[PDB]
Point group: D2
Chain length 331, copies 4
Amino acid sequence: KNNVVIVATGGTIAGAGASSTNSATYSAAKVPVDALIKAVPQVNDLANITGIQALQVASESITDKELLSLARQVNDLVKKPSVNGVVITHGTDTMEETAFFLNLVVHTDKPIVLVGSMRPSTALSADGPLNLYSAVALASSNEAKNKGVMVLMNDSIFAARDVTKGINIHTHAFVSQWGALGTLVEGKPYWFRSSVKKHTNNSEFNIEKIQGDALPGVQIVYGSDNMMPDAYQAFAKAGVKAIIHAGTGNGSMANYLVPEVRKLHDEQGLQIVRSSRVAQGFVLRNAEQPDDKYGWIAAHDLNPQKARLLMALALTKTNDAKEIQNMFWNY
Amino acid sequence: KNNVVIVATGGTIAGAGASSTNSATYSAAKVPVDALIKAVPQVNDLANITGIQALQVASESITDKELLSLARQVNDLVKKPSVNGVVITHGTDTMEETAFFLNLVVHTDKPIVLVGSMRPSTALSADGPLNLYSAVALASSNEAKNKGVMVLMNDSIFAARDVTKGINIHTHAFVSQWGALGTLVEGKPYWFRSSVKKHTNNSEFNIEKIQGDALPGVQIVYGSDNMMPDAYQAFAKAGVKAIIHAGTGNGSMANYLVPEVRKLHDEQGLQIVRSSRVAQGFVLRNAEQPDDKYGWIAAHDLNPQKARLLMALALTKTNDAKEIQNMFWNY
Amino acid sequence: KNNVVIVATGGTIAGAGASSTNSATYSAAKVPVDALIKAVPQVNDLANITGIQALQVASESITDKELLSLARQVNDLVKKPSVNGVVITHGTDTMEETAFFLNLVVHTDKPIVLVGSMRPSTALSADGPLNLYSAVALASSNEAKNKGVMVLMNDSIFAARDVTKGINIHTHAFVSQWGALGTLVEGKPYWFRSSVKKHTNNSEFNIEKIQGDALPGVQIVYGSDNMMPDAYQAFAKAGVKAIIHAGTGNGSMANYLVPEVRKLHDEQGLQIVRSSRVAQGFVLRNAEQPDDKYGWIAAHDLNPQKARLLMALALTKTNDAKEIQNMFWNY
Amino acid sequence: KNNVVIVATGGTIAGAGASSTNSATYSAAKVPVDALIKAVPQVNDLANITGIQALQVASESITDKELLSLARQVNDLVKKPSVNGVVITHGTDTMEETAFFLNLVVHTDKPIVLVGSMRPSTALSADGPLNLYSAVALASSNEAKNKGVMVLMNDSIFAARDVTKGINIHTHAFVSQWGALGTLVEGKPYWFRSSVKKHTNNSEFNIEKIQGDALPGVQIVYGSDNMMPDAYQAFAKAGVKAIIHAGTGNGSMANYLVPEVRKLHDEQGLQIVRSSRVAQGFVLRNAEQPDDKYGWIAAHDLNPQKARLLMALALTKTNDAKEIQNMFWNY
């Protein structure tokens, strides 16, 4: 009987716009926070519920403004003696992204859970309910503190730092290579692992310290064979501070672009983070390109999207390639 | 005692340039085809060996010219009564890419195996040898015909259509969601599944019919939250025929770009293939954007790189969005 | 508008006995076939439905009598010009077992689908419905013929030969190492692979030819370190025809038992199938024990339960260790 | 330049007995500890090496005597100011078993690594070397303390509590559902997770306190459909203290045996641990059988082999079903 606040951002559960049959019609915009709370009324047996409608966006279309604004609201909410835990309803597409961000800039020990649904609130066998309820049992859990930010999908408790969308039609679309912190079954949380990274109270970054309504321009260029320097060139010329190179294999750069990408960093001062298109394992620094020689960064095990966010947050504090390289090794 | 031809393209095995200790120093350019054949001399007990040095590139840097040129050589080689099977030594990064391509344009029933190594020929416990030898036992196998093109890594026989680099430091970096056709252990192949797709002899495409030294411009734009229309715009303006949209989730387009991406297709005639950044499951047509309304294509279960190649090959035969949509459903 | 027959065997969906909240209370016995058909009424838009209550057992407690009796009913049903496809409601625990069996002894080309549920019909976000409906869309599918027997769980279409329960609380408990034949999303089936094994019309075995109400005694002994010959000895002495040795690793027998297990085969004529406790990869004949020397069988890639059934069916036709070894290589 | 002691127990690496070609011929007994140390001489650049030949067994055949004897040696070795870390060469089959045991009874903070090989020291591309060397870099690592016991296979650092043999021919046969603590690449360890369980210094159990040359009889009965009470009955009658029931699904007992298994516990005082044959997820207490009613134990997420060892160690301290149930929830 802790007060969990459910913070609605939109997404397929707190919005279903088609199918009373199956998955595919992921069309949100639709069911605000109470419409939800009132649909899974069991959630009330778990705790004292209060629903805030923070945004009513569709996941894929979130920008830094929405991130900085949900972060601030979840920061304001989390500072109150009466908020015990917080649950966020989020579209599955970019969930990974918001939990990395809050993981990063929110200084709190209380449970911050992003919960979602792979089926419209109206498809047969809809996943949302059992996830909202279960998401709730943890946010109200007395032993959910200092886990960092967590995702809760298919009874799994995931650490924000590595949870990502690995599958596309299935209710069990959320995976991790280091795995889940644990499982939540029939109201109760079960723990197995703990992150060895920096999050929440032990994190350089802070939305309280961040004041814009945007972060410095960081943008992603995807690797494949037969590439062109056109996106790099378009992005430099647009005034982005760094490019995350979604390198093939281990952070790989095509020998026709090193020339090009080197100047974009040397001349126009672009930062260069070497990540991959390969979901598991990590990009070893100095391995497949000499970062040291070139002044680049090895984004370790962050997927492009996530690396994107660390760098945007990184360049709020330094321009120094080694100190940033240092954060990619810690988070 | 079949004649397998080993066709060297470069890559870490048929080239090791650093470490007598471990993985990380993936530096090719180094050990041509005989240097190789003479290092795993057991390969000769398997068949009659002949090594061709087709290129001496590093995987990540292959272009369409190298693709069209290896394709033609593997086509010329495969038409001879004396070539029973062919083995290709390839860098692991873009292997997936060459096997999709040949899978596609080579009209033959004989075994075409791309083999590679995750450790420099000189690291302790180097994977290359057992893979070259094993790759050989299949290409010389009498029951390796009409499997399509196959990859052979960590004793696994993979179908070219879905095999990709899922892990980064490990010898078992090659995965598939539909799985392996089978396993090769101690010289012998073991079968379990067969593709239900079109490949080799039953394939619209053909390098014999393709004459350039390049295919039509197709290029990849990667999805994440806070995106810009700059790469699309850079690529249209450069004269690419289609963009593969590495959409977040199920092929997702940010509502700030549909406006933009629509005109780039409507006005400047760009083709638009909606794929994902999510490795497994597939992008359902009409689901998360109305392709029908917009004239776009659902790239089904092809990862961006691979979708990239189908489209380049697609626009050699049609400009018709439905007939192409039709190939994404078949290959 | 094909006539699919839903054949109810019991299990958690066609029986929920506790929880209106979550998973754990798997207590069947409860909801017969119509109670079901009338709960997922959408199933009727898919086809002409007819529900048969074949048994009302709990999965784990099925015996050979229940197997032979469901087999015969599914054989009688499948011979009729008006039965287009059949769907079986089954407890998840031993589903794998019934689909292997029918896979084996039912001579038909029509779709035989075993469908189940990991949550009681009453838990929040219950999986049953979307699975019954979806199971139905395939059994009524015009392109579901000669796939063998299939399992349909979490929108996945699985081949009976290798599908097994790999996870325990989750809706996505059914895995395979060779993977799924395909996926069923929003009424439609999507194909990727096909088995390369013998099933249904191309299968030695037949319930029509089998007349008892039991098969010959075949029983499983589990491997671990510090074992005793007591179960073998108990089973020989009880009059079982063969023992499936759930060997550690690659079919491994402890050197303190080879002496013992050899005599139980040499003297009392016991058959010995060397399988494993390791779920993936397979037990190579002559590898870790000399079968040839000893007169044993390498059960290839069948898990103990499944090997158990092949052997019971094997000893209905031969006692010849090589001809049986031959079936383990084919099914 | 720490002193790691390599403790040889036998197994395929520190013993290869056939193949200069591939995997399958796993025949140990063969290459003692120095024969090894002298074959991967790079290991000496990592630290000061000293090889002890503790046993020269083949993995699958280890008993409690070998366990209690390796435990004591690794306990004696670990108490010395000059032993910084210890590496154990072990057969892959039952490795999981020894690391669980030592994990349990060894009171130390120093790195205890069990290392192995899936290919004979003589197969092409043999895994042993890169694993022995790498195993060494951690045992000599200054930041390998209080991780518990670890397995090191395919550059992965695994926690003893959950690491098991999931695949059979491949070099990457060792998996975990909660994942790896981290990876070791090119001499350096990389951390991501930490166990949340009790091990080494914070563990009830102790080989120093254990004096026999055997532990109380605990033995495993495997679940499938069509079972018999003969093994239970054979084991009770032999004088085992508890049976680990390798239940189908979630710890499931066939209704024809509950009668039987109940008396074997009620009458002859047998302990009953309900585990599964399902490798992932865990057996929830009171779920699929009422333990409370019956006086049984839910072995949570321990596979049969491992549950086997906890119970043997459990019954050295209590006979009390709740206090033991309590250890299954902690280790």
